Every structure is written in C-alpha cells, then in structure tokens.
Amino acid sequence: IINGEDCSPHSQPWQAALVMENELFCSGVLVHPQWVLSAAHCFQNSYTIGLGLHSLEADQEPGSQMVEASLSVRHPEYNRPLLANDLMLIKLDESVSESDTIRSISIASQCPTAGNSCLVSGWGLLANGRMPTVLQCVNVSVVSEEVCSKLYDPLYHPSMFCAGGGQDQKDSCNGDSGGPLICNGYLQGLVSFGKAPCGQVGVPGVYTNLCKFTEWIEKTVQA
Numbered sequence: 001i002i003n004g005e006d007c008s009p010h011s012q013p014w015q016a017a018l019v020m021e022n023e024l025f026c027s028g029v030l031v032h033p034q035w036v037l038s039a040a041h042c043f044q045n046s047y048t049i050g051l052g053l054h055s056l057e058a059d060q061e062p063g064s065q066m067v068e069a070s071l072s073v074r075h076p077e078y079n080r081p082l083l084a085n086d087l088m089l090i091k092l093d094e095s096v097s098e099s100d101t102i103r104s105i106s107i108a109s110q111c112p113t114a115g116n117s118c119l120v121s122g123w124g125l126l127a128n129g130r131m132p133t134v135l136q137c138v139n140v141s142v143v144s145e146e147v148c149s150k151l152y153d154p155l156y157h158p159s160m161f162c163a164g165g166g167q168d169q170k171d172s173c174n175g176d177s178g179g180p181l182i183c184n185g186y187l188q189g190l191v192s193f194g195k196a197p198c199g200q201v202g203v204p205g206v207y208t209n210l211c212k213f214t215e216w217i218e219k220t221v222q223a
C-alpha cells in the first residue's frame with residue numbers, strides 16, 4: 001500500500017493473509033466461514049491463511065486463527081484475456097468462529113460507480129520501499145470506465161475496474177494482491193495489477209470486478 005496509514009486495529013476483520021515459507025505473498029477476503037476469496041495469480045497447491053491479524057504476529061494476536069487449506073478453485077477464464085478474470089476461491093480446511101476480529105464480508109451487489117470513494121487494505125510494500133508491520137489503509141476512488149478502458153487498452157477487460165490514480169499517489173503494490181477493496185461496506189473488488197512503479201499520477205490500479213462474478217462465486221460454494 002502506497003501513501004496509506006495504519007488501519008485501526010482490526011478495522012478490516014475480513015482481511016486474510018497468504019503465507020509461503022517464512023514470508024507473506026498475498027492477501028485474501030473471508031467471504032464465507034469456510035471460503036476465502038483472492039486473486040488467481042496467488043494460486044498455491046496448499047495454503048496457510050492468517051485471520052484476525054492486525055500484525056503478522058500470531059502471538060501478539062490473542063484472537064487469531066492460522067488455519068490451512070489445499071482446495072482452491074481458479075476462475076476457468078483466468079488470464080484469458082491476459083490478466084483478465086483474476087479471482088480465485090480458497091476453501092478452508094475448517095470453518096471459522098464468527099468473532100470480533102474475524103468476520104466475513106458480503107460481495108458488492110451492484111457494480112462500481114466513478115468517483116465513488118472506496119478503501120483498500122493490505123501488507124504490501126509501503127509508500128517507501130518496504131514491508132509494513134501492521135495492515136495498511138488507503139482510500140482511492142473509482143475511475144470512469146472510459147478513462148480506465150483507454151488507459152489500459154488492450155489489457156482492459158470488463159472483469160476489471162480502475163481505482164485511484166489521483167494526485168495523492170495513493171495506490172496498491174506488490175504484496176497487496178488479493179487484498180480487498182471495500183465500497184459502501186461492500187467488497188467491490190480485489191487487488192489485481194497496475195503499471196509499475198506504483199503511485200503514478202494518472203495511473204490508477206486495476207482490481208477484480210467482483211460484481212461480474214457474484215453468480216459464479218455462489219455457484220462454486222454451493223455444490
């Protein structure tokens with residue numbers, strides 16, 4: 001997250017983290033007590049999801065569950081077109097509790113609207129160059145489908161939407177992938193990609209257009 005701040009301790013209780021060896025590579029979103037939503041390019045044969053964590057310290061977090069899983073469904077249309085349909089559903093090895101630091105969120109019912117101020121959180125690279133210690137928070141608004149489609153032509157696809165790109169250089173970055181983008185208390189999208197370096201004036205970051213997969217996500221979970 002570039003030019004963000006420290007989220008209020010557990011202000012985003014749906015936020016999830018994907019960890020490999022000793023590091024952290026992606027984030028996710030708890031959209032169901034047994035299902036985590038993330039970005040397809042974060043695929044892994046097996047996962048280790050950290051929930052209810054303001055900091056990546058399971059010890060400093062009394063209320064946090066480091067669950068695991070292995071079943072993950074990538075969208076059939078991922079990367080076709082290139083970078084398109086970037087979303088994936090990870091099924092937890094076990095349900096989770098419904099606590100005050102771990103809560104599932106609902107997926108945006110309607111689609112993005114330009115200028116609509118939203119919020120994105122994650123543990124990716126900071127405004128400077130490093131890894132943060134606690135979840136970062138930054139606010140970015142949605143860009144008209146016109147500006148977005150033109151700015152990223154031909155990579156732009158209906159399964160994506162831009163946000164940010166303002167002169168406040170607020171944007172996402174490596175490590176924030178899969179992170180959640182909330183608008184009006186709803187999960188509008190997920191961190192997908194964007195031109196590097198991050199935080200370029202006029203170059204908003206692209207996210208997954210979840211409103212265009214509401215039917216698929218449901219269908220996939222109920223089977």
Ligand SMILES: NC(=[NH2+])c1ccc(N)cc1
Nearest residue numbers: 172173174192193194205
């Ligand atoms: N928002 C961005 N510029 C971005 C998002 C994801 C990513 N992997 C790299 C850059």
Ligand SMILES: [Zn+2]
Nearest residue numbers: 009054060061
């Ligand atoms: Zn805490």
